[PDB]
Amino acid sequence: XXNXXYX
Amino acid sequence: XXNXXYX
Ligand SMILES: *[C@@H]1O[C@H](CO)[C@@H](O)[C@H](O)[C@H]1O[C@H]1C[C@](C)(N)[C@H](O)[C@H](C)O1
Ligand SMILES: *[C@@H]1O[C@H](CO)[C@@H](O)[C@H](O)[C@H]1O[C@H]1C[C@](C)(N)[C@H](O)[C@H](C)O1
Ligand SMILES: CC(=O)NCC(=O)O
Ligand SMILES: [Cl-]
Ligand SMILES: [Cl-]
Ligand SMILES: [Cl-]
C-alpha cells in the first residue's frame, strides 16, 4: 500500500 | 511500483 486514493 | 527506495 503506502499510496492513498480515493477511487 | 509500490515499494520505495532509494538505492
Ligand atoms: C514516492 O517517490 C516517487 C518517485 O519514485 C515520488 O514522485 C513520490 O512523490 C513519492 O510519494 C510520496 C507519497 C506516497 C506515495 N503516498 C508516500 O507517502 C511516499 C512515501 O511519498
Ligand atoms: C488517510 O491518510 C491521511 C493522511 O495521513 C489521514 O489524514 C486520513 O485520516 C486517512 O484516512 C483514514 C480514513 C479512511 C479513508 N476511511 C481509511 O480508513 C484510511 C486508510 O485512513
Ligand atoms: C525507485 C522507485 O521508483 N520507487 C517507487 C515505487 O516503488 O513505486
Ligand atoms: Cl507514507
Ligand atoms: Cl479507494
Ligand atoms: Cl531509487
Biggest beta sheet summary of chain A: none
Number of helices of chain A: 0
What does the radius of gyration of chain A come to?
A: 6 Å
Number of strands of chain A: 0
Q: What helical percentage do the residues of chain A reach?
A: under 10%
Distance between the termini of chain A: 14 Å
The oligomeric state is: homodimer
| Fraction of residues in β-strands of chain A | under 5%
Shape category of chain A: elongated
Bound molecules: a molecule of 2 linked components (BGC-RER), acetylamino-acetic acid, chloride ion
Class from secondary-structure proportions of chain A? little secondary structure
Characterization of this structure:
By secondary structure, chain A is mostly loops. Helices cover 0% and strands 0% of the residues of chain A. The first copy, chain A, has no helices and no strands. The chains hardly touch. One chloride ion binds at residues 5-7 of chain B.
Write the layout of secondary structure elements.
The structure is a homodimer of 7-residue chains.
Chain A: no helix or strand
The complex binds a molecule of 2 linked components (BGC-RER) (2 copies), acetylamino-acetic acid and chloride ion (3 copies).
The site of acetylamino-acetic acid (AAC) has 5 residues of chain B, from loops.
Attribute tags:
homodimer; 7 residues; little secondary structure; binds a molecule of 2 linked components (BGC-RER); binds acetylamino-acetic acid; binds chloride ion
Describe the structure concisely.
Two copies of one chain form a homodimer. Chain A has no helix or strand. Chain A has 7 residues and is low in regular secondary structure.
